[PDB]
Design a protein around this ligand. Structure first.
Ligand SMILES: [Mg+2]
Ligand SMILES: [Zn+2]
Ligand SMILES: [Zn+2]
Ligand SMILES: [Zn+2]
Lengths: 48, 67, 404, 260, 51, 484, 46, 115
RNA sequence: GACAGGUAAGUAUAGGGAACCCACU
């Protein structure tokens, strides 16, 4: 059930692999722009 | 982008080795074993093969400018 | 042509040169002139101005030419000197046990431009002719200048004890009648320092003679270095297991001392020194302990160094590096400091989230207990990055301040 | 006051390399021989290229560079060939050049490998090394469908000094004093230095005892050929060319002295 | 107090031990672009004519 | 805008992560288990700085491991891996934890300058400026992190046999000697693409622009450059050689040698190459709009900038043919030689370790791992491995002087190392002037080499000349040579 | 006179005349490329 | 742009003397041979042969500048001997060396080929 | 009328600036 250190190296690197597969590298840019378009524009229009 | 024709250091022909190296790799030889089989003794040539990245396939993924 | 490198800090930043046209697309400089220009070949670009009239040409030829600019009025001492490979090579060359065969002396002699054309009597005739680097350098030296210097590694007690004029280590330089009688040349004897051999050459012989002197030193010593060889590698960074163990013991003892001091301070048994709050006193004690540990470790590493070690070669010749540098490479890197203090508690009573609160230990406050070769644990790496950032910022600000 | 009496021993000989030893000769002579192997042995290689069409992902200079790097069998044709510059023909001629033509077009969904096989020579005696009759052909470029590559080239004589492509050798291992008897090097820790293949020493021993009267003899060579020439051909041509250079120098010296 | 000036070149610098300290290597292209005015005299008239 | 990083959660003294999680992640392709699933399961958790202030964190599970004197024993999180603290540029550095930090900082920028394959589809992009290396190579020594920077897909640099030795002195002061034979074989050769653009504007019926092959009899503003290279459309064709100040886009404008003024676009002065390709379109306003991409093959030469991954940069001092270069007992010769004087003060011990492990990996037929904080890798282990392959355990070797064949008294450190050629090339910086065009406002020399400008004899230069006392030279520099 | 251009999308050849609005007659695509010149071009294989 | 043509290394430019002779006035019986489009190969072999020659008080070579392809050989002989004669004899002896080595190598290659 | 071939006559084969940004030593 646990992870011995020898396994732990590969385990942590697999974790990082999955993280980067999921997210990418410009995830912050893409998510910020997507949130802007999706929410903020309508919020501004309504607040007007 | 493509396997260099000669080893930069010593000048041994390696351009005729990339396909065979890939064949061995898919034949499950380790990289060192494949290099030895191809005869790349000097680590200059071994580098020439190991470090190579054949970008030409990615380049060929694009359609030509002309039909 | 006048030759310049921004920023133009002093007179020697702009100096005259005679043009020689060679194929490729760069200005080719002699290595010596780099020092006055404060130039390195890391991509530095330089400007060239061509005087257009005979009057300006004469002005430059008589005032700004590098030979005339050899000695600066700023500190009445030469600005250029033998540097880098040439300096290390000459230090090795002028060692006592350097002997040259007929052919080797042959090549070096003809590279010596000012040579009179007479092969000197070899310092050894039987069982086989052999010259010495000292002989060849005596040929290089111009005129009949007399000079006395001391090699960098010259022990002080030698001057008092016996063998005063016959150095067991050959660490005393004596040029007489323009002949290197004895000693190992180094930065002390060939660099910009006052009373250096180049300085005395300029003072006695003409600036032109000193120019030829520089050129001959560089050419001959480089050609000999072709044979001699000089390198640096992991072998020169490795130390013996005994010295590794000694350094580990020193570090462990220093850590234990710091722990004892911390425990005493927490028990309140510690008391402030005059003119210092208790916290200042505690910091002073910790810093003193760690500095002593680093000094002891560096001394141990330098002792462990062998005569073949290239780091020691280079530091001794004065071409590059320092004993502190060798200590950092071999033994602990040492304490990291920001604003002249240990790493501040950026977090809440914590340098990093990975330490308990109110931890004033060496590791907690950023003491790199590992040598560069041994690598750095992530926290030590971060703290070292902080220190380097401090240095870079200091540079980037002092540039503008000093310019103004 | 006169020449040595060099002797030779071929310890190995294959189609791709020759290993031998030369004794009773000067280190200077040995090193010059090595340098001639590397640099001053004539060879035929592509040096003129005209790209009628090139749709490949690679550009014309890239393709020409690879074509030049391709080696060509030059066992005897080079000797007959004269340097293009020396030759009188206006543009090119058999005496000074060899023509090649390449023309490929990818008309299929699978990648087409334009290898040295496609290099069509005019003189059968001169051909790509791999095309000779297992070694595969030297890849030049890959073409996806709808692509083409047509070009006409000329290979001429030349030696490595002018450009590495004429260099025949593919690794010239040179050695002498396997055991460090002459002490030309200095091992701070000789024990930790692996024995040379030619080393003749007991394992406990690190290096031969210093020889004050020693001099570099028994130079070991291992010349690997790039397939352009048989290694023995490389060695013989190198010696011939060095002798030729010395003879020409003698002629020039005689002319100069006679004029003086 | 400061100006841009003609007859000035600029380029990267590389080491060259084989040059006297007072010498400077210059590319042929820069030398060609640069010219120094020389007055004609019977002494140098032939040389300048050849130039 | 609140920054945040992931962290493995710790309860009591054990990670919430488990071997089952690791296996599911391994099989992520099929079972579709993913990082999002990890986050949902709650093994990992995002933490920002403010929360970090209270979090108690551990390097690795080793800290969680019980100890004779428990330091914390109350951990709450654990690093996924310490190396993650680095960024993109810093990640490509092998053994960064063996260098003085400022050198890592320098490498962070020299990496940005390295030439490689900036994008797979470069063949179509008409980017204003681009550089493409002929033979990129993934480094023989790689941090695990570059697997995600995709450096393998788009490497920028070549693994090169480097000997850290003094040789003829031409590599002194951060200079590097280079193997001319390697350069001939394509070592570090690259191609430089420059994109020019032009458009014909019909702003006014009175005055309009047109692409064409102008003729002296009609148009007036022609230089002596030949327009034959152009075609009937005022555009050059691909595969055409071109030199500096050579018209490439013949354009003309209708005046209010008659009724036509030349507005053609010439090739940048001192430049040369071949027209890679031409594209013709209409801009937003229908006007004809042509972009021309021109490629020039840059062979590395004296003065070109190169750099390792360890803050060690230098210009190619000189190039020696293979026979001139020193050689091992084998035929191997160093592609590059770098003065040893770099390392002492620089503390780029990572450079040396990289060279050693590169030799090891090349001999072993593998890719070395230079992940920073990896206890499993150390100099002693690397040296033992290297010795196993019949080499000196520290990487030293016996080299022979190329010119004379004689052994070299010292044994040279030599081995593979990843080098990278920076965009700044001497050909793009060389510049000189003798009475070129001058500014309009003041008649002083123009600025910038693209305009054939003149160098600035600045205030400190004036002051240095004042100190020299060269009054006449100062007068010439500031008055007679600038704007009499 | 002919001035054959290759369309980007359909990769089709088509003549274009001066003052002619740039648009592939075949696909209405506005991006075209000049065909490779016919001039003699040579490259020493250095 | 400034890169010299590769052939320039070995090709004598129009009107270039392959070899030039001067007398080193500093000492008697001393000559300087400036050889163009030559390098360490010839320089080293000739120097070694001359050093082998006993009458030669002085023999050596150097490359004044690597970017240039010229070499200078300084040779001083005994008064009863000429540097020109020493140079010629050294070249002759090297030529004999090469001829002997060539024929012996041919013999060895043949013999290895048969077995 | 068109179109294909030939003969004769005329035509065609002077230079930006600012701003900002990035990067460099
Ligand atoms: Mg600099
Ligand atoms: Zn190789
Ligand atoms: Zn011909
Ligand atoms: Zn279309």
């Amino acid at each position: 059930d646990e992870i011995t250190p020898d396994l732990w190296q590969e385990a942590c690197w697999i974790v990082i692999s999955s993280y980067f597969d999921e997210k990418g590298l410009v995830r912050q840019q893409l998510d910020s722009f997507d949130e802007f378009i999706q929410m903020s524009v309508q919020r501004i229009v309504e607040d007007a | 982008m493509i396997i260099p024709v000669r080893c930069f250091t010593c000048g041994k022909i390696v351009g005729n080795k990339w396909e065979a190296y890939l064949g061995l790799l898919q034949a499950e030889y380790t990289e060192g074993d494949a290099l030895d089989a191809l005869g790349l003794k000097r680590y200059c040539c071994r580098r020439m093969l190991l470090a190579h990245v054949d970008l030409i396939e990615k380049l060929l993924n694009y359609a030509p400018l002309e039909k | 042509v006048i030759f310049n490198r921004q920023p133009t800090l002093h007179k020697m930043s702009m100096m005259g040169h005679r043009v020689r046209i060679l194929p490729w697309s760069t200005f080719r400089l002699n290595l010596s002139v780099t020092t006055p220009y404060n130039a390195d070949f890391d991509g530095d670009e330089m400007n060239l101005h061509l005087p257009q009239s005979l009057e300006t040409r004469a002005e430059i030829q008589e005032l700004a030419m590098v030979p005339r600019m050899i000695v600066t009025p700023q500190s009445n001492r030469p600005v250029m000197g033998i540097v880098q490979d040439t300096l290390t090579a000459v230090r090795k060359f002028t060692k006592r046990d350097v002997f040259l065969e007929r052919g080797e002396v042959m090549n070096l002699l003809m590279f010596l431009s000012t040579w009179d054309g007479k092969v000197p009597q070899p310092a050894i005739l039987k069982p086989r002719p052999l010259w010495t680097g000292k002989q060849i350098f005596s040929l290089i030296i111009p005129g009949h200048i007399n000079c006395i210097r001391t090699h960098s590694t010259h022990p002080d007690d030698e001057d008092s004890g016996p063998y005063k004029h016959i150095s067991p280590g050959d660490t005393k330089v004596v040029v007489e009648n323009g002949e290197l009688i004895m000693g190992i040349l180094c930065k002390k004897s060939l660099g910009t320092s006052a009373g250096s051999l180049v300085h005395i050459s300029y003072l006695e012989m003409g600036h032109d003679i000193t120019r030829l002197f520089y050129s001959n030193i560089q050419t001959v010593i480089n050609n000999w270095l072709l044979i001699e060889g000089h390198t640096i590698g992991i072998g020169d960074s490795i130390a013996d297991s005994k010295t590794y163990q000694d350094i580990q013991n020193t570090i462990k003892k220093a850590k234990q001392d710091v722990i004892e001091v911390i425990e005493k301070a927490h028990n309140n048994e510690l008391e402030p020194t005059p003119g210092n709050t208790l916290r200042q006193t505690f910091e002073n004690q910790v810093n003193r302990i760690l500095n002593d540990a680093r000094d002891k470790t560096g001394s141990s590493a330098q002792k462990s160094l062998s005569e073949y070690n290239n780091f020691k070669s280079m530091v001794v010749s004065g071409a590059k590096g320092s004993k502190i540098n060798i200590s950092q490479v071999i033994a602990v890197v040492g304490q990291q400091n920001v604003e002249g203090k240990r790493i501040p508690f950026g977090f809440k009573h914590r340098t990093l989230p990975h330490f308990i609160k109110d931890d004033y230990g060496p590791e907690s406050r950023g003491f790199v207990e590992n040598s560069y070769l041994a690598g750095l644990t992530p926290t030590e790496f971060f703290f070292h990055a902080m220190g380097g950032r401090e240095g870079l910022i200091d540079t980037a600000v002092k540039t503008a301040e000093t310019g103004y | 006051p006169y020449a040595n009496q060099p002797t030779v021993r071929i310890t190995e000989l294959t189609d791709e390399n020759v290993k031998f030893i030369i004794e009773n000769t000067d280190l200077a002579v040995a090193n010059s021989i090595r340098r001639v192997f590397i640099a001053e042995v004539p060879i035929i290689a592509i040096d003129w290229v005209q790209i009628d069409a090139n749709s490949s992902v690679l550009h014309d200079e890239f393709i020409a560079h690879r074509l030049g790097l391709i080696p060509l069998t030059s066992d005897d044709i080079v000797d007959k060939l004269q340097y293009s510059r020396d030759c009188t023909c206006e543009e090119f001629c058999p005496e000074c050049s060899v023509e090649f033509t390449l023309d490929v077009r990818c008309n299929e969904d699978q990648t087409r490998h334009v290898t040295s096989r496609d290099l069509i020579s005019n003189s059968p005696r001169v051909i790509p090394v791999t095309s000779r009759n297992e070694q595969d052909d030297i890849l030049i470029v890959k073409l996806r469908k709808g692509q083409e590559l047509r070009l006409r080239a000329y290979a001429k004589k030349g030696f490595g000094k002018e450009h590495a492509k004429w260099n025949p050798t593919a690794g010239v291992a040179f050695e002498y004093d396997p055991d460090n008897a002459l002490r030309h090097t200095v091992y701070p820790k000789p024990e930790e230095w692996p024995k040379s293949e030619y080393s003749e020493l007991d394992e406990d021993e690190s290096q031969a005892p210093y020889d004050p009267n020693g001099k570099p003899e028994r130079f070991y060579y291992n010349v690997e050929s790039c397939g352009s020439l048989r290694p023995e051909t490389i060695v013989l041509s190198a010696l011939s060319g060095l002798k030729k250079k010395l003879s020409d120098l003698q002629t020039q010296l005689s002319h100069e002295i006679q004029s003086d | 107090m400061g100006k841009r000036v003609d007859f000035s070149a600029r380029t990267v610098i590389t080491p060259d031990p084989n040059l006297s300290i007072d010498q400077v290597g210059v590319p042929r292209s820069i030398a060609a672009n640069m010219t120094f005015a020389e007055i004609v005299t019977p002494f140098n008239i032939d040389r300048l004519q050849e130039l | 805008g609140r920054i945040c990083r992931p962290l493995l959660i710790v309860e009591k003294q054990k990670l919430l992560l488990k071997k089952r999680h690791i296996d599911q992640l391994k099989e992520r392709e099929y079972n579709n288990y993913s990082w999002q699933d990890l986050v949902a399961s709650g093994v990992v958790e995002y933490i920002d700085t403010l929360e970090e202030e209270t979090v108690m964190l551990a390097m690795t599970p080793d800290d969680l491991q019980e100890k004779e004197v428990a330091y914390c024993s109350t951990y709450t999180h654990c690093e996924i891996h310490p190396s993650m603290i680095l960024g993109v540029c810093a990640s490509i550095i092998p053994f960064p934890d063996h260098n003085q930090s400022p050198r890592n900082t320098y490498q962070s920028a020299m990496g940005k300058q390295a030439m490689g394959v900036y994008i797979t589809n470069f063949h179509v992009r008409m980017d204003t400026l681009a550089h493409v290396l002929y033979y990129p190579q993934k480094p023989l020594v790689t941090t695990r992190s570059m697997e995600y920077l995709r450096f393998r897909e788009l490497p920028a640099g070549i693994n090169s046999i480097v000997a850290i030795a003094s040789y003829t002195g031409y590599n002194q002061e951060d200079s590097v000697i280079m193997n001319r034979s390697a350069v001939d074989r394509g070592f570090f050769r690259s191609v430089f693409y420059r994109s020019y653009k032009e458009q014909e504007s019909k702003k006014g019926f009175d005055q309009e622009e047109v692409f064409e092959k102008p003729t002296r009899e009609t148009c007036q503003g022609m230089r002596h450059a030949i327009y034959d290279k152009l075609d009937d459309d005022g555009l050059i064709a691909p595969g055409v050689r071109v030199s500096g100040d050579d018209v490439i886009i013949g354009k003309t404008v209708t005046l209010p040698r008659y009724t036509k003024r030349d507005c053609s676009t010439f090739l940048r002065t001192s430049e040369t190459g071949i027209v890679d390709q031409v594209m013709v379109t209409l801009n937003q306003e229908g006007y004809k709009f042509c972009k021309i991409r021109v490629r020039s093959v840059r062979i590395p030469q004296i003065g070109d900038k190169f750099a390792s991954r360890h803050g060690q940069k230098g210009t190619c001092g000189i190039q020696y043919r293979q026979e001139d270069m020193p050689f091992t007992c084998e035929g191997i010769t160093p592609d590059i030689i770098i003065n040893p004087h770099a390392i002492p003060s620089r503390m780029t011990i990572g450079h040396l370790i990289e060279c050693l492990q590169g030799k090891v990996s090349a001999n072993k037929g593998e890719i070395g791992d230079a992940t920073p904080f990896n206890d499993a890798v150390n100099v002693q282990k690397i040296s033992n491995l290297l010795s196993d392959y019949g080499y000196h355990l520290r990487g030293n070797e016996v080299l022979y002087n190329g010119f004379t064949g004689r052994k070299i008294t010292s044994q040279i450190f030599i081995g593979p190392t990843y080098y990278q050629r920076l965009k700044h090339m001497v050909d793009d910086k060389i510049h000189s002037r003798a009475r070129g065009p001058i500014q309009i406002l003041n008649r002083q020399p123009m600025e910038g080499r693209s305009r054939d400008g003149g160098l600035r004899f600045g205030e400190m230069e004036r002051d240095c000349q004042i100190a020299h006392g060269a009054a006449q030279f100062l007068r010439e520099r500031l008055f007679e040579a600038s704007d009499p | 006179q002919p001035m054959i251009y290759i369309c980007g999308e359909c990769h089709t050849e088509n003549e274009i005349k001066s003052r002619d609005p740039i648009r592939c007659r075949e696909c209405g695509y506005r991006i075209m490329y000049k065909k490779r010149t016919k001039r003699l071009v040579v490259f020493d294989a250095r | 742009m400034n890169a010299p043509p590769a052939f320039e290394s070995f090709l004598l430019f129009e009107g270039e003397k392959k070899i030039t002779i001067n007398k080193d006035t500093k000492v008697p019986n001393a000559c300087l041979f400036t050889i163009n489009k030559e390098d360490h190969t010839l320089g080293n072999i000739i120097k070694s042969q001359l050093l082998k020659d006993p009458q030669v008080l002085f023999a050596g070579y150097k490359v004044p500048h690597p970017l240039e392809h010229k070499i200078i050989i300084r040779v001083q002989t005994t008064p009863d001997y000429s540097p020109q004669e020493a140079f010629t004899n050294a070249i002759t002896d090297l030529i004999s060396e090469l001829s002997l080595l060539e024929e012996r190598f041919r013999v060895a290659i043949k013999d290895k080929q048969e077995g």
